[PDB]
Amino acid sequence: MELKNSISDYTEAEFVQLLKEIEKENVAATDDVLDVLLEHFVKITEHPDGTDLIYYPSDNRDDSPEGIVKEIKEWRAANGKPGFKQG
Amino acid sequence: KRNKPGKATGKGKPVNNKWLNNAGKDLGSPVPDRIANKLRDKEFKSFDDFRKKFWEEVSKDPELSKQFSRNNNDRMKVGKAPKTRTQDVSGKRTSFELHHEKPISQNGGVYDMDNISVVTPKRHIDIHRGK
Ligand SMILES: [Zn+2]
Protein backbone atom coordinates (compact mmCIF):
# COMPACT_ATOMS: atom_id res chain seq x y z
CA MET A 1 0.00 0.00 0.00
CA GLU A 2 1.16 3.52 0.79
CA LEU A 3 4.26 3.62 3.00
CA LYS A 4 3.98 6.83 5.12
CA ASN A 5 7.12 8.43 6.49
CA SER A 6 6.20 8.52 10.21
CA ILE A 7 4.24 6.64 12.83
CA SER A 8 2.32 9.91 13.33
CA ASP A 9 0.90 9.66 9.77
CA TYR A 10 -0.56 6.20 10.63
CA THR A 11 -3.77 5.44 12.48
CA GLU A 12 -3.59 2.09 14.34
CA ALA A 13 -5.77 0.47 11.64
CA GLU A 14 -3.45 1.58 8.85
CA PHE A 15 -0.50 0.27 10.80
CA VAL A 16 -2.27 -3.09 11.20
CA GLN A 17 -2.72 -3.05 7.37
CA LEU A 18 1.07 -2.67 6.98
CA LEU A 19 1.57 -5.65 9.38
CA LYS A 20 -0.80 -7.85 7.30
CA GLU A 21 1.04 -6.88 4.13
CA ILE A 22 4.22 -8.09 5.84
CA GLU A 23 2.43 -11.38 6.82
CA LYS A 24 1.51 -11.82 3.11
CA GLU A 25 5.12 -11.34 1.99
CA ASN A 26 6.34 -13.83 4.68
CA VAL A 27 4.63 -16.47 2.55
CA ALA A 28 5.78 -15.23 -0.85
CA ALA A 29 8.36 -17.35 -2.68
CA THR A 30 11.13 -14.82 -1.94
CA ASP A 31 11.86 -12.04 0.58
CA ASP A 32 12.60 -9.23 -1.91
CA VAL A 33 9.47 -7.21 -1.16
CA LEU A 34 9.17 -8.41 2.45
CA ASP A 35 12.56 -6.96 3.31
CA VAL A 36 11.72 -3.43 2.03
CA LEU A 37 8.57 -3.57 4.06
CA LEU A 38 10.57 -4.66 7.16
CA GLU A 39 13.12 -1.87 6.68
CA HIS A 40 10.15 0.55 6.55
CA PHE A 41 8.63 -0.98 9.73
CA VAL A 42 11.98 -0.60 11.53
CA LYS A 43 12.55 2.94 10.33
CA ILE A 44 9.20 4.34 11.42
CA THR A 45 8.70 2.47 14.71
CA GLU A 46 12.23 3.34 15.91
CA HIS A 47 12.19 0.46 18.45
CA PRO A 48 15.73 -0.81 19.17
CA ASP A 49 14.59 -4.37 18.70
CA GLY A 50 13.24 -3.72 15.20
CA THR A 51 11.88 -6.79 13.48
CA ASP A 52 12.07 -8.72 16.79
CA LEU A 53 8.66 -7.13 17.64
CA ILE A 54 7.16 -9.11 14.77
CA TYR A 55 9.25 -12.31 14.79
CA TYR A 56 10.25 -12.66 18.47
CA PRO A 57 7.36 -11.25 20.55
CA SER A 58 7.68 -11.27 24.33
CA ASP A 59 5.64 -13.84 26.21
CA ASN A 60 4.03 -11.04 28.21
CA ARG A 61 1.96 -9.81 25.25
CA ASP A 62 -0.02 -11.33 22.41
CA ASP A 63 1.74 -12.57 19.28
CA SER A 64 -0.73 -10.77 16.96
CA PRO A 65 -0.93 -7.54 14.92
CA GLU A 66 -2.91 -6.02 17.84
CA GLY A 67 -0.21 -7.10 20.29
CA ILE A 68 2.54 -5.58 18.09
CA VAL A 69 0.67 -2.28 17.80
CA LYS A 70 0.00 -2.21 21.54
CA GLU A 71 3.67 -2.79 22.45
CA ILE A 72 4.74 -0.11 19.94
CA LYS A 73 2.25 2.39 21.38
CA GLU A 74 3.42 1.70 24.99
CA TRP A 75 7.11 1.88 24.11
CA ARG A 76 6.67 5.12 22.14
CA ALA A 77 4.61 6.73 24.87
CA ALA A 78 7.13 5.61 27.54
CA ASN A 79 9.92 7.28 25.51
CA GLY A 80 7.95 10.46 24.95
CA LYS A 81 7.77 9.94 21.18
CA PRO A 82 4.74 10.89 19.02
CA GLY A 83 2.20 8.10 18.71
CA PHE A 84 -0.30 6.92 16.12
CA LYS A 85 -2.60 9.34 14.31
CA GLN A 86 -5.75 9.77 16.38
CA GLY A 87 -7.68 10.31 13.15
CA LYS B 1 27.86 -30.09 -6.39
CA ARG B 2 25.07 -28.59 -4.28
CA ASN B 3 23.11 -28.02 -7.46
CA LYS B 4 22.93 -31.68 -8.38
CA PRO B 5 20.22 -34.07 -7.17
CA GLY B 6 20.68 -36.53 -4.32
CA LYS B 7 19.12 -38.48 -1.44
CA ALA B 8 19.08 -37.19 2.14
CA THR B 9 20.78 -39.47 4.66
CA GLY B 10 21.58 -39.30 8.36
CA LYS B 11 20.02 -39.64 11.77
CA GLY B 12 20.04 -36.14 13.19
CA LYS B 13 19.98 -35.57 16.95
CA PRO B 14 17.48 -35.23 19.76
CA VAL B 15 16.59 -31.61 20.56
CA ASN B 16 14.84 -29.83 23.43
CA ASN B 17 12.43 -26.82 23.50
CA LYS B 18 15.36 -24.43 22.85
CA TRP B 19 16.47 -26.00 19.59
CA LEU B 20 18.05 -22.93 18.02
CA ASN B 21 19.29 -21.14 21.15
CA ASN B 22 22.88 -22.03 20.24
CA ALA B 23 22.59 -21.37 16.49
CA GLY B 24 24.96 -18.45 16.99
CA LYS B 25 27.71 -20.47 18.68
CA ASP B 26 30.27 -23.09 17.52
CA LEU B 27 28.74 -25.08 14.64
CA GLY B 28 25.14 -24.16 15.44
CA SER B 29 22.14 -26.44 15.90
CA PRO B 30 21.81 -30.02 14.63
CA VAL B 31 19.14 -31.34 12.29
CA PRO B 32 16.46 -32.80 14.64
CA ASP B 33 16.22 -36.58 14.61
CA ARG B 34 12.43 -36.37 13.99
CA ILE B 35 13.05 -34.16 10.96
CA ALA B 36 15.80 -36.50 9.73
CA ASN B 37 13.29 -39.36 9.98
CA LYS B 38 10.92 -37.51 7.61
CA LEU B 39 13.55 -36.56 5.01
CA ARG B 40 15.67 -39.71 4.99
CA ASP B 41 15.99 -41.46 1.65
CA LYS B 42 14.06 -38.80 -0.21
CA GLU B 43 15.58 -37.31 -3.36
CA PHE B 44 16.02 -33.57 -3.99
CA LYS B 45 16.83 -31.54 -7.13
CA SER B 46 19.33 -29.37 -5.27
CA PHE B 47 20.44 -28.26 -1.83
CA ASP B 48 18.11 -25.30 -2.17
CA ASP B 49 15.30 -27.81 -2.69
CA PHE B 50 16.37 -29.79 0.38
CA ARG B 51 16.44 -26.51 2.28
CA LYS B 52 12.84 -25.69 1.40
CA LYS B 53 11.63 -29.13 2.32
CA PHE B 54 13.63 -28.94 5.55
CA TRP B 55 11.89 -25.82 6.73
CA GLU B 56 8.46 -27.13 5.64
CA GLU B 57 8.97 -30.25 7.80
CA VAL B 58 9.97 -28.10 10.77
CA SER B 59 6.65 -26.22 10.42
CA LYS B 60 4.78 -29.53 10.54
CA ASP B 61 6.50 -30.90 13.72
CA PRO B 62 4.35 -29.67 16.66
CA GLU B 63 7.30 -29.82 19.09
CA LEU B 64 9.45 -27.56 16.90
CA SER B 65 6.72 -25.28 15.44
CA LYS B 66 5.82 -24.28 18.97
CA GLN B 67 9.32 -22.79 19.37
CA PHE B 68 8.65 -20.12 16.72
CA SER B 69 6.38 -17.08 16.42
CA ARG B 70 3.33 -17.09 14.07
CA ASN B 71 5.14 -14.96 11.50
CA ASN B 72 8.13 -17.29 11.58
CA ASN B 73 5.93 -20.40 11.24
CA ASP B 74 4.31 -18.92 8.11
CA ARG B 75 7.77 -18.45 6.51
CA MET B 76 8.75 -22.04 7.23
CA LYS B 77 5.51 -23.39 5.88
CA VAL B 78 6.50 -22.16 2.41
CA GLY B 79 10.04 -23.30 2.80
CA LYS B 80 11.82 -20.11 3.85
CA ALA B 81 14.13 -20.03 6.83
CA PRO B 82 12.87 -18.30 9.95
CA LYS B 83 14.11 -14.73 10.54
CA THR B 84 16.82 -14.59 13.23
CA ARG B 85 16.77 -12.09 16.08
CA THR B 86 17.95 -8.64 14.99
CA GLN B 87 21.27 -9.00 16.80
CA ASP B 88 22.23 -12.19 14.80
CA VAL B 89 21.81 -10.70 11.37
CA SER B 90 24.59 -9.88 8.89
CA GLY B 91 23.71 -7.21 6.37
CA LYS B 92 21.05 -8.60 3.95
CA ARG B 93 21.36 -12.05 5.55
CA THR B 94 18.58 -11.98 8.11
CA SER B 95 17.42 -15.61 8.13
CA PHE B 96 18.87 -18.84 9.63
CA GLU B 97 21.28 -20.60 7.25
CA LEU B 98 22.35 -24.18 6.75
CA HIS B 99 26.07 -25.00 7.09
CA HIS B 100 27.95 -28.07 5.82
CA GLU B 101 30.49 -29.14 8.45
CA LYS B 102 32.66 -30.88 5.88
CA PRO B 103 32.68 -28.85 2.62
CA ILE B 104 31.37 -30.35 -0.60
CA SER B 105 34.77 -29.53 -2.03
CA GLN B 106 36.21 -32.53 -0.14
CA ASN B 107 33.87 -35.51 0.06
CA GLY B 108 31.49 -33.49 2.21
CA GLY B 109 27.96 -34.84 1.90
CA VAL B 110 25.63 -32.20 0.39
CA TYR B 111 22.56 -34.06 1.68
CA ASP B 112 24.07 -35.78 4.70
CA MET B 113 21.94 -34.48 7.58
CA ASP B 114 24.65 -35.41 10.08
CA ASN B 115 27.00 -33.04 8.14
CA ILE B 116 24.38 -30.20 8.21
CA SER B 117 23.62 -27.68 10.98
CA VAL B 118 21.51 -24.48 11.41
CA VAL B 119 23.43 -21.30 12.10
CA THR B 120 22.75 -17.55 12.30
CA PRO B 121 24.24 -15.48 9.45
CA LYS B 122 26.68 -13.74 11.76
CA ARG B 123 28.01 -17.07 13.12
CA HIS B 124 28.06 -18.62 9.64
CA ILE B 125 30.35 -15.89 8.23
CA ASP B 126 32.65 -16.34 11.21
CA ILE B 127 32.82 -20.13 10.79
CA HIS B 128 34.03 -19.82 7.21
CA ARG B 129 36.62 -17.15 7.99
CA GLY B 130 38.33 -19.13 10.78
CA LYS B 131 36.52 -17.78 13.86
ZN1 LIG C 1 28.83 -23.02 5.87
PDB file of C-alpha atoms and ligand atoms in Angstrom:
ATOM      1  CA  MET A   1       0.000   0.000   0.000  1.00  0.00           C
ATOM      2  CA  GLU A   2       1.164   3.524   0.789  1.00  0.00           C
ATOM      3  CA  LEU A   3       4.263   3.621   3.000  1.00  0.00           C
ATOM      4  CA  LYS A   4       3.982   6.833   5.116  1.00  0.00           C
ATOM      5  CA  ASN A   5       7.123   8.434   6.493  1.00  0.00           C
ATOM      6  CA  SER A   6       6.198   8.523  10.208  1.00  0.00           C
ATOM      7  CA  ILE A   7       4.238   6.645  12.830  1.00  0.00           C
ATOM      8  CA  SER A   8       2.316   9.906  13.334  1.00  0.00           C
ATOM      9  CA  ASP A   9       0.898   9.659   9.765  1.00  0.00           C
ATOM     10  CA  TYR A  10      -0.558   6.205  10.630  1.00  0.00           C
ATOM     11  CA  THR A  11      -3.773   5.438  12.477  1.00  0.00           C
ATOM     12  CA  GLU A  12      -3.589   2.085  14.336  1.00  0.00           C
ATOM     13  CA  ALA A  13      -5.773   0.469  11.639  1.00  0.00           C
ATOM     14  CA  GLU A  14      -3.450   1.585   8.854  1.00  0.00           C
ATOM     15  CA  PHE A  15      -0.505   0.271  10.795  1.00  0.00           C
ATOM     16  CA  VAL A  16      -2.268  -3.086  11.205  1.00  0.00           C
ATOM     17  CA  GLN A  17      -2.718  -3.054   7.366  1.00  0.00           C
ATOM     18  CA  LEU A  18       1.075  -2.672   6.982  1.00  0.00           C
ATOM     19  CA  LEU A  19       1.570  -5.653   9.384  1.00  0.00           C
ATOM     20  CA  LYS A  20      -0.796  -7.850   7.297  1.00  0.00           C
ATOM     21  CA  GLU A  21       1.037  -6.877   4.134  1.00  0.00           C
ATOM     22  CA  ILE A  22       4.224  -8.094   5.843  1.00  0.00           C
ATOM     23  CA  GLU A  23       2.426 -11.382   6.819  1.00  0.00           C
ATOM     24  CA  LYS A  24       1.512 -11.816   3.110  1.00  0.00           C
ATOM     25  CA  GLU A  25       5.119 -11.340   1.991  1.00  0.00           C
ATOM     26  CA  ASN A  26       6.342 -13.826   4.683  1.00  0.00           C
ATOM     27  CA  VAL A  27       4.634 -16.466   2.555  1.00  0.00           C
ATOM     28  CA  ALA A  28       5.785 -15.226  -0.852  1.00  0.00           C
ATOM     29  CA  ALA A  29       8.360 -17.353  -2.683  1.00  0.00           C
ATOM     30  CA  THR A  30      11.130 -14.816  -1.944  1.00  0.00           C
ATOM     31  CA  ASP A  31      11.861 -12.037   0.579  1.00  0.00           C
ATOM     32  CA  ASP A  32      12.603  -9.226  -1.910  1.00  0.00           C
ATOM     33  CA  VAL A  33       9.470  -7.213  -1.158  1.00  0.00           C
ATOM     34  CA  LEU A  34       9.168  -8.409   2.450  1.00  0.00           C
ATOM     35  CA  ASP A  35      12.564  -6.959   3.309  1.00  0.00           C
ATOM     36  CA  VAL A  36      11.722  -3.430   2.025  1.00  0.00           C
ATOM     37  CA  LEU A  37       8.570  -3.566   4.065  1.00  0.00           C
ATOM     38  CA  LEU A  38      10.566  -4.664   7.158  1.00  0.00           C
ATOM     39  CA  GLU A  39      13.119  -1.869   6.678  1.00  0.00           C
ATOM     40  CA  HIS A  40      10.151   0.553   6.548  1.00  0.00           C
ATOM     41  CA  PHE A  41       8.633  -0.975   9.730  1.00  0.00           C
ATOM     42  CA  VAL A  42      11.981  -0.599  11.531  1.00  0.00           C
ATOM     43  CA  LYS A  43      12.550   2.941  10.327  1.00  0.00           C
ATOM     44  CA  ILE A  44       9.204   4.340  11.416  1.00  0.00           C
ATOM     45  CA  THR A  45       8.704   2.466  14.708  1.00  0.00           C
ATOM     46  CA  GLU A  46      12.229   3.336  15.911  1.00  0.00           C
ATOM     47  CA  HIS A  47      12.189   0.461  18.452  1.00  0.00           C
ATOM     48  CA  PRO A  48      15.725  -0.807  19.173  1.00  0.00           C
ATOM     49  CA  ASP A  49      14.594  -4.367  18.705  1.00  0.00           C
ATOM     50  CA  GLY A  50      13.243  -3.715  15.198  1.00  0.00           C
ATOM     51  CA  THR A  51      11.877  -6.790  13.484  1.00  0.00           C
ATOM     52  CA  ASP A  52      12.069  -8.722  16.790  1.00  0.00           C
ATOM     53  CA  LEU A  53       8.660  -7.134  17.640  1.00  0.00           C
ATOM     54  CA  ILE A  54       7.162  -9.111  14.771  1.00  0.00           C
ATOM     55  CA  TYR A  55       9.247 -12.310  14.787  1.00  0.00           C
ATOM     56  CA  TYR A  56      10.251 -12.656  18.475  1.00  0.00           C
ATOM     57  CA  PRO A  57       7.360 -11.248  20.548  1.00  0.00           C
ATOM     58  CA  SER A  58       7.679 -11.267  24.334  1.00  0.00           C
ATOM     59  CA  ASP A  59       5.643 -13.841  26.212  1.00  0.00           C
ATOM     60  CA  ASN A  60       4.031 -11.043  28.210  1.00  0.00           C
ATOM     61  CA  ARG A  61       1.956  -9.806  25.249  1.00  0.00           C
ATOM     62  CA  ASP A  62      -0.022 -11.333  22.406  1.00  0.00           C
ATOM     63  CA  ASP A  63       1.737 -12.574  19.278  1.00  0.00           C
ATOM     64  CA  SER A  64      -0.730 -10.772  16.963  1.00  0.00           C
ATOM     65  CA  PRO A  65      -0.935  -7.544  14.915  1.00  0.00           C
ATOM     66  CA  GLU A  66      -2.912  -6.018  17.843  1.00  0.00           C
ATOM     67  CA  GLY A  67      -0.205  -7.098  20.293  1.00  0.00           C
ATOM     68  CA  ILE A  68       2.544  -5.585  18.090  1.00  0.00           C
ATOM     69  CA  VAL A  69       0.670  -2.282  17.804  1.00  0.00           C
ATOM     70  CA  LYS A  70       0.004  -2.207  21.545  1.00  0.00           C
ATOM     71  CA  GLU A  71       3.666  -2.792  22.446  1.00  0.00           C
ATOM     72  CA  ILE A  72       4.741  -0.110  19.941  1.00  0.00           C
ATOM     73  CA  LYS A  73       2.251   2.391  21.381  1.00  0.00           C
ATOM     74  CA  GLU A  74       3.416   1.701  24.989  1.00  0.00           C
ATOM     75  CA  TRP A  75       7.111   1.876  24.106  1.00  0.00           C
ATOM     76  CA  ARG A  76       6.674   5.122  22.136  1.00  0.00           C
ATOM     77  CA  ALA A  77       4.606   6.729  24.869  1.00  0.00           C
ATOM     78  CA  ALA A  78       7.129   5.610  27.538  1.00  0.00           C
ATOM     79  CA  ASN A  79       9.923   7.280  25.506  1.00  0.00           C
ATOM     80  CA  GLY A  80       7.949  10.455  24.945  1.00  0.00           C
ATOM     81  CA  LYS A  81       7.767   9.940  21.182  1.00  0.00           C
ATOM     82  CA  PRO A  82       4.741  10.892  19.024  1.00  0.00           C
ATOM     83  CA  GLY A  83       2.198   8.103  18.713  1.00  0.00           C
ATOM     84  CA  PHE A  84      -0.303   6.924  16.117  1.00  0.00           C
ATOM     85  CA  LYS A  85      -2.597   9.340  14.308  1.00  0.00           C
ATOM     86  CA  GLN A  86      -5.754   9.768  16.380  1.00  0.00           C
ATOM     87  CA  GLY A  87      -7.676  10.307  13.149  1.00  0.00           C
TER      88      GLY A  87
ATOM     89  CA  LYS B   1      27.858 -30.093  -6.388  1.00  0.00           C
ATOM     90  CA  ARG B   2      25.065 -28.593  -4.280  1.00  0.00           C
ATOM     91  CA  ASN B   3      23.110 -28.020  -7.460  1.00  0.00           C
ATOM     92  CA  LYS B   4      22.926 -31.677  -8.382  1.00  0.00           C
ATOM     93  CA  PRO B   5      20.218 -34.070  -7.171  1.00  0.00           C
ATOM     94  CA  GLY B   6      20.679 -36.533  -4.316  1.00  0.00           C
ATOM     95  CA  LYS B   7      19.119 -38.480  -1.438  1.00  0.00           C
ATOM     96  CA  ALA B   8      19.079 -37.193   2.143  1.00  0.00           C
ATOM     97  CA  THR B   9      20.783 -39.469   4.658  1.00  0.00           C
ATOM     98  CA  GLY B  10      21.580 -39.297   8.358  1.00  0.00           C
ATOM     99  CA  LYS B  11      20.025 -39.643  11.770  1.00  0.00           C
ATOM    100  CA  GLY B  12      20.038 -36.136  13.194  1.00  0.00           C
ATOM    101  CA  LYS B  13      19.983 -35.569  16.953  1.00  0.00           C
ATOM    102  CA  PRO B  14      17.480 -35.229  19.760  1.00  0.00           C
ATOM    103  CA  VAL B  15      16.592 -31.607  20.564  1.00  0.00           C
ATOM    104  CA  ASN B  16      14.840 -29.827  23.435  1.00  0.00           C
ATOM    105  CA  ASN B  17      12.434 -26.818  23.504  1.00  0.00           C
ATOM    106  CA  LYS B  18      15.365 -24.432  22.855  1.00  0.00           C
ATOM    107  CA  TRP B  19      16.471 -26.002  19.589  1.00  0.00           C
ATOM    108  CA  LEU B  20      18.052 -22.933  18.016  1.00  0.00           C
ATOM    109  CA  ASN B  21      19.291 -21.136  21.151  1.00  0.00           C
ATOM    110  CA  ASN B  22      22.878 -22.027  20.239  1.00  0.00           C
ATOM    111  CA  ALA B  23      22.590 -21.371  16.490  1.00  0.00           C
ATOM    112  CA  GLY B  24      24.961 -18.447  16.988  1.00  0.00           C
ATOM    113  CA  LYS B  25      27.713 -20.471  18.676  1.00  0.00           C
ATOM    114  CA  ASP B  26      30.268 -23.086  17.519  1.00  0.00           C
ATOM    115  CA  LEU B  27      28.736 -25.077  14.644  1.00  0.00           C
ATOM    116  CA  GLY B  28      25.141 -24.164  15.438  1.00  0.00           C
ATOM    117  CA  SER B  29      22.138 -26.443  15.903  1.00  0.00           C
ATOM    118  CA  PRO B  30      21.812 -30.024  14.629  1.00  0.00           C
ATOM    119  CA  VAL B  31      19.142 -31.344  12.292  1.00  0.00           C
ATOM    120  CA  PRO B  32      16.456 -32.798  14.644  1.00  0.00           C
ATOM    121  CA  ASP B  33      16.223 -36.583  14.609  1.00  0.00           C
ATOM    122  CA  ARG B  34      12.432 -36.374  13.990  1.00  0.00           C
ATOM    123  CA  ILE B  35      13.052 -34.163  10.960  1.00  0.00           C
ATOM    124  CA  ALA B  36      15.800 -36.496   9.726  1.00  0.00           C
ATOM    125  CA  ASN B  37      13.288 -39.355   9.985  1.00  0.00           C
ATOM    126  CA  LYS B  38      10.919 -37.509   7.606  1.00  0.00           C
ATOM    127  CA  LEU B  39      13.551 -36.562   5.009  1.00  0.00           C
ATOM    128  CA  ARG B  40      15.667 -39.711   4.995  1.00  0.00           C
ATOM    129  CA  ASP B  41      15.987 -41.460   1.648  1.00  0.00           C
ATOM    130  CA  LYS B  42      14.058 -38.801  -0.210  1.00  0.00           C
ATOM    131  CA  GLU B  43      15.585 -37.309  -3.359  1.00  0.00           C
ATOM    132  CA  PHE B  44      16.023 -33.574  -3.985  1.00  0.00           C
ATOM    133  CA  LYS B  45      16.830 -31.536  -7.128  1.00  0.00           C
ATOM    134  CA  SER B  46      19.331 -29.368  -5.271  1.00  0.00           C
ATOM    135  CA  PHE B  47      20.443 -28.261  -1.832  1.00  0.00           C
ATOM    136  CA  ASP B  48      18.107 -25.304  -2.174  1.00  0.00           C
ATOM    137  CA  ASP B  49      15.296 -27.809  -2.690  1.00  0.00           C
ATOM    138  CA  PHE B  50      16.366 -29.788   0.383  1.00  0.00           C
ATOM    139  CA  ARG B  51      16.435 -26.514   2.276  1.00  0.00           C
ATOM    140  CA  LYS B  52      12.839 -25.688   1.405  1.00  0.00           C
ATOM    141  CA  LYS B  53      11.631 -29.125   2.316  1.00  0.00           C
ATOM    142  CA  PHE B  54      13.629 -28.942   5.549  1.00  0.00           C
ATOM    143  CA  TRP B  55      11.894 -25.823   6.734  1.00  0.00           C
ATOM    144  CA  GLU B  56       8.465 -27.126   5.644  1.00  0.00           C
ATOM    145  CA  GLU B  57       8.968 -30.254   7.801  1.00  0.00           C
ATOM    146  CA  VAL B  58       9.969 -28.096  10.771  1.00  0.00           C
ATOM    147  CA  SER B  59       6.655 -26.216  10.418  1.00  0.00           C
ATOM    148  CA  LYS B  60       4.777 -29.528  10.543  1.00  0.00           C
ATOM    149  CA  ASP B  61       6.495 -30.902  13.716  1.00  0.00           C
ATOM    150  CA  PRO B  62       4.347 -29.671  16.661  1.00  0.00           C
ATOM    151  CA  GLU B  63       7.301 -29.817  19.088  1.00  0.00           C
ATOM    152  CA  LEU B  64       9.448 -27.563  16.904  1.00  0.00           C
ATOM    153  CA  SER B  65       6.716 -25.277  15.436  1.00  0.00           C
ATOM    154  CA  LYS B  66       5.821 -24.278  18.973  1.00  0.00           C
ATOM    155  CA  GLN B  67       9.324 -22.787  19.371  1.00  0.00           C
ATOM    156  CA  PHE B  68       8.655 -20.122  16.721  1.00  0.00           C
ATOM    157  CA  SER B  69       6.375 -17.078  16.417  1.00  0.00           C
ATOM    158  CA  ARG B  70       3.328 -17.094  14.072  1.00  0.00           C
ATOM    159  CA  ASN B  71       5.145 -14.962  11.497  1.00  0.00           C
ATOM    160  CA  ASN B  72       8.133 -17.288  11.581  1.00  0.00           C
ATOM    161  CA  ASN B  73       5.933 -20.396  11.242  1.00  0.00           C
ATOM    162  CA  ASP B  74       4.307 -18.916   8.109  1.00  0.00           C
ATOM    163  CA  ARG B  75       7.769 -18.447   6.512  1.00  0.00           C
ATOM    164  CA  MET B  76       8.749 -22.040   7.233  1.00  0.00           C
ATOM    165  CA  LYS B  77       5.510 -23.395   5.885  1.00  0.00           C
ATOM    166  CA  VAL B  78       6.504 -22.157   2.407  1.00  0.00           C
ATOM    167  CA  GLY B  79      10.045 -23.301   2.800  1.00  0.00           C
ATOM    168  CA  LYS B  80      11.817 -20.114   3.850  1.00  0.00           C
ATOM    169  CA  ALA B  81      14.127 -20.034   6.831  1.00  0.00           C
ATOM    170  CA  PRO B  82      12.867 -18.304   9.947  1.00  0.00           C
ATOM    171  CA  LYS B  83      14.110 -14.727  10.537  1.00  0.00           C
ATOM    172  CA  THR B  84      16.823 -14.593  13.230  1.00  0.00           C
ATOM    173  CA  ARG B  85      16.769 -12.087  16.075  1.00  0.00           C
ATOM    174  CA  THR B  86      17.946  -8.638  14.988  1.00  0.00           C
ATOM    175  CA  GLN B  87      21.267  -9.004  16.796  1.00  0.00           C
ATOM    176  CA  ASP B  88      22.229 -12.186  14.798  1.00  0.00           C
ATOM    177  CA  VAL B  89      21.806 -10.704  11.368  1.00  0.00           C
ATOM    178  CA  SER B  90      24.588  -9.880   8.889  1.00  0.00           C
ATOM    179  CA  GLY B  91      23.708  -7.210   6.367  1.00  0.00           C
ATOM    180  CA  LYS B  92      21.054  -8.598   3.955  1.00  0.00           C
ATOM    181  CA  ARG B  93      21.361 -12.054   5.551  1.00  0.00           C
ATOM    182  CA  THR B  94      18.581 -11.981   8.112  1.00  0.00           C
ATOM    183  CA  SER B  95      17.418 -15.613   8.134  1.00  0.00           C
ATOM    184  CA  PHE B  96      18.872 -18.840   9.625  1.00  0.00           C
ATOM    185  CA  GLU B  97      21.281 -20.598   7.255  1.00  0.00           C
ATOM    186  CA  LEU B  98      22.354 -24.179   6.751  1.00  0.00           C
ATOM    187  CA  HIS B  99      26.071 -24.997   7.092  1.00  0.00           C
ATOM    188  CA  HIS B 100      27.947 -28.068   5.822  1.00  0.00           C
ATOM    189  CA  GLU B 101      30.488 -29.142   8.449  1.00  0.00           C
ATOM    190  CA  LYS B 102      32.663 -30.876   5.884  1.00  0.00           C
ATOM    191  CA  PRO B 103      32.683 -28.847   2.620  1.00  0.00           C
ATOM    192  CA  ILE B 104      31.373 -30.346  -0.599  1.00  0.00           C
ATOM    193  CA  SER B 105      34.775 -29.528  -2.033  1.00  0.00           C
ATOM    194  CA  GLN B 106      36.212 -32.527  -0.142  1.00  0.00           C
ATOM    195  CA  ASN B 107      33.871 -35.508   0.060  1.00  0.00           C
ATOM    196  CA  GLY B 108      31.494 -33.494   2.212  1.00  0.00           C
ATOM    197  CA  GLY B 109      27.963 -34.841   1.897  1.00  0.00           C
ATOM    198  CA  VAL B 110      25.630 -32.203   0.389  1.00  0.00           C
ATOM    199  CA  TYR B 111      22.561 -34.060   1.679  1.00  0.00           C
ATOM    200  CA  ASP B 112      24.068 -35.784   4.704  1.00  0.00           C
ATOM    201  CA  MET B 113      21.943 -34.477   7.582  1.00  0.00           C
ATOM    202  CA  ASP B 114      24.651 -35.411  10.079  1.00  0.00           C
ATOM    203  CA  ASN B 115      26.996 -33.036   8.141  1.00  0.00           C
ATOM    204  CA  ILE B 116      24.377 -30.198   8.215  1.00  0.00           C
ATOM    205  CA  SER B 117      23.621 -27.681  10.981  1.00  0.00           C
ATOM    206  CA  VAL B 118      21.508 -24.480  11.409  1.00  0.00           C
ATOM    207  CA  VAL B 119      23.432 -21.301  12.099  1.00  0.00           C
ATOM    208  CA  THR B 120      22.747 -17.549  12.305  1.00  0.00           C
ATOM    209  CA  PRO B 121      24.236 -15.479   9.447  1.00  0.00           C
ATOM    210  CA  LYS B 122      26.682 -13.737  11.757  1.00  0.00           C
ATOM    211  CA  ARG B 123      28.005 -17.065  13.121  1.00  0.00           C
ATOM    212  CA  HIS B 124      28.057 -18.619   9.642  1.00  0.00           C
ATOM    213  CA  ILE B 125      30.354 -15.894   8.229  1.00  0.00           C
ATOM    214  CA  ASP B 126      32.654 -16.341  11.209  1.00  0.00           C
ATOM    215  CA  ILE B 127      32.815 -20.126  10.793  1.00  0.00           C
ATOM    216  CA  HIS B 128      34.034 -19.820   7.211  1.00  0.00           C
ATOM    217  CA  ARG B 129      36.623 -17.149   7.989  1.00  0.00           C
ATOM    218  CA  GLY B 130      38.331 -19.129  10.782  1.00  0.00           C
ATOM    219  CA  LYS B 131      36.519 -17.785  13.856  1.00  0.00           C
TER     220      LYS B 131
HETATM  221 ZN    ZN C   1      28.828 -23.020   5.865  1.00  0.00          ZN
END
